[PDB]
Amino acid sequence: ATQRFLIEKFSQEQIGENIVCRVICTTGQIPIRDLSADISQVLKEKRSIKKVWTFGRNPACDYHLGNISRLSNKHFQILLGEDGNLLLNDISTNGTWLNGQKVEKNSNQLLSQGDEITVGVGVESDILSLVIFINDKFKQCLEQNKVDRIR
Amino acid sequence: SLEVTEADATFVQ
Numbered sequence: 001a002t003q004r005f006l007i008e009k010f011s012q013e014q015i016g017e018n019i020v021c022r023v024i025c026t027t028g029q030i031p032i033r034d035l036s037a038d039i040s041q042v043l044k045e046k047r048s049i050k051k052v053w054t055f056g057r058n059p060a061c062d063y064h065l066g067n068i069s070r071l072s073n074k075h076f077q078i079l080l081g082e083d084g085n086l087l088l089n090d091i092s093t094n095g096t097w098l099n100g101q102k103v104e105k106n107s108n109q110l111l112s113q114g115d116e117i118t119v120g121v122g123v124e125s126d127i128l129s130l131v132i133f134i135n136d137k138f139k140q141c142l143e144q145n146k147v148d149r150i151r
Numbered sequence: 152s153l154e155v156t157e158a159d160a161t162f163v164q
Contacts, residue, residue, distance in 0.1 A: 069157050070157045072156045093156050093157075094159050
């Protein structure tokens with residue numbers, strides 16, 4: 001008697017389960033991945049940080065690159081928090097770039113729509129570009145946050 | 152630290 005289970009099969013695939021942002025490599029080196037964070041954890045977390053992703057050539061890093069000598073193990077890191085926004089934290093040996101503009105390392109920056117981060121600057125032939133995608137679904141939850149219905 | 156991964160640094164400060 002699985003009445004509720006039967007309906008669950010109706011959807012099958014649920015997009016935007018708890019996705020924060022998605023990283024898409026436009027330079028063709030790293031496979032598209034999706035960064036995610038749980039809402040309960042966000043509302044529960046209060047240590048000036050909920051969930052942060054680390055990117056680089058390190059297998060530990062939340063993001064694995066194609067192994068670039070210029071890029072560092074953990075070239076860059078992305079943090080999620082605030083009232084309802086995302087932040088980008090650069091953590092490379094040579095620096096992290098935003099649309100051609102180099103930002104201050106280990107510095108928090110406001111997220112941008114379809115933004116892109118460039119890394120491995122120094123040699124025109126040794127730079128890597130990454131694009132960041134934002135899940136509108138996630139914003140909806142944060143925008144509504146507390147739902148007025150149940151007492 | 153300096154050993155692995157190429158790095159840069161300007162000599163003007």
